[PDB]
Design a protein that fits this description.
Length: 102
């Protein structure tokens, strides 16, 4: 039984804000912070990096989040804060049940 999965309200606040999703959700340093965080494995890194441009690259980063978990989502969330994308992440903070905690 999967526990601590990605919350619907959380995952939605992220993807639903497609108003700025594809527009501000980057994959460069954001993924760097996620892999260094240890949430994105070499396989994860490979897929996103396999894609040629922000097209399927950023889409792949967001596409991973489509079926990851709360833990990874808060990591992807934290990565947004790592690259000055606090606004998008704030839009997702509604679903994130933590306030840094670091």
């Amino acid at each position: 039984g999967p526990l601590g999965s990605m919350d619907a309200k959380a995952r939605n606040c992220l993807l639903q804000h497609r108003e700025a999703l594809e527009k501000d959700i980057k994959t460069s340093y954001i993924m760097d912070h996620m892999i260094s965080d240890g949430f994105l494995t070499i396989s994860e890194e490979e897929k996103v990096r396999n894609e040629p441009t922000q097209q399927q690259r950023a889409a792949m980063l967001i596409k991973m989040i489509l079926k990851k978990d709360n833990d990874s989502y808060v990591s992807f969330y934290n990565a947004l804060l790592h690259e000055g994308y606090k606004d998008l992440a704030a839009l997702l903070h509604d679903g994130i049940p933590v306030v840094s905690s670091s």
